[PDB]
């Protein structure tokens, strides 16, 4: 069977809010080292990769590798019946037909048991070859969410450029045009050589739904290959999003 008890149940609520907007369904890969989920969106333009290591749960048991097909819309409806303070346990029998989510109030006075029907999901795990990056940018998550939300009132694409000490986000549309320049100092830039890529903002605004899991965010870019947008979870993992440049 599989049993995992997460003290900060808020992490799951957040993870699920940030997944269901991007993807409706996914396979949750449970092993003894933790929870790995991975999925392209329907239009196959971007992918989410979620990692939750066993060390980060106060209890964690996986007796046999498991693959659960989960309607993430439905799991998130259910995760809404959990307090932000609630301790959340996840439990499935190695024949995975159902997933139990148990929500416990810290004072233990209230316990809620929910049972979710799991799903049949044929999925061919994908390979993310090893990638090193010309430009990595670490900056407050909320600052990066503001940049995306705003430029997206200006246009539907954003050119992102690294060239020196800073990075520039540009967009342009009917109203006119606009760009945002960030310099160093908690914004950091490990720029190895300049790079310039264009991205659909509609997707980045999906990604930024993960913003509440972390107060920093990292972007990784090299010429002509997917942007990596990564939010760390506690000490216990991360939510990485990937996105294909504009043709």
């Amino acid at each position: 069977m599989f049993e995992a008890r997460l003290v900060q149940g808020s992490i799951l609520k957040k993870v699920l809010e940030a997944l269901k907007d991007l993807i409706n369904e996914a396979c949750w890969d449970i092993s003894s080292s933790g929870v790995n989920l991975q999925s392209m969106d329907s239009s196959h333009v971007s992918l989410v990769q979620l990692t939750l290591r066993s060390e980060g749960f106060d209890t964690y048991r996986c007796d046999r590798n498991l693959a659960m097909g989960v309607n993430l819309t439905s799991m998130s409806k259910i995760l809404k019946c959990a307090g932000n303070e609630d301790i959340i346990t996840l439990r499935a029998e190695d024949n995975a037909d159902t997933l139990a989510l148990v929500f416990e109030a810290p004072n233990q006075e209230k316990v809620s048991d929910y049972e979710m029907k799991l799903m049949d999901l044929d999925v061919e795990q994908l390979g993310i070859p090893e990638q090193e990056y010309s430009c990595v940018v670490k900056m407050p998550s909320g600052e990066f969410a503001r940049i995306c939300r705003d430029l997206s009132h200006i246009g539907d694409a954003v050119v992102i450029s690294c060239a020196k000490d800073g990075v520039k986000f540009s967009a342009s549309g009917e109203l006119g045009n606009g760009n945002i320049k960030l310099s160093q100092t908690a914004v950091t830039i490990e720029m190895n050589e300049p790079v310039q890529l264009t991205f659909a903002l509609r997707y980045l605004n999906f990604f930024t739904k993960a913003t509440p899991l972390s107060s920093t965010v990292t972007l990784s870019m090299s010429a002509d290959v997917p942007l990596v947008v990564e939010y760390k979870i506690a000490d216990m993992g991360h939510l990485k999003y990937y996105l294909a440049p504009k043709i």
Partner: peptide, 12 residues
């Protein structure tokens, strides 16, 4: 548009 990521990430 679609399937632009299909070229970097293929089934394993």
């Amino acid at each position: 548009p679609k399937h632009t990521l299909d070229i970097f990430f293929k089934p394993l």
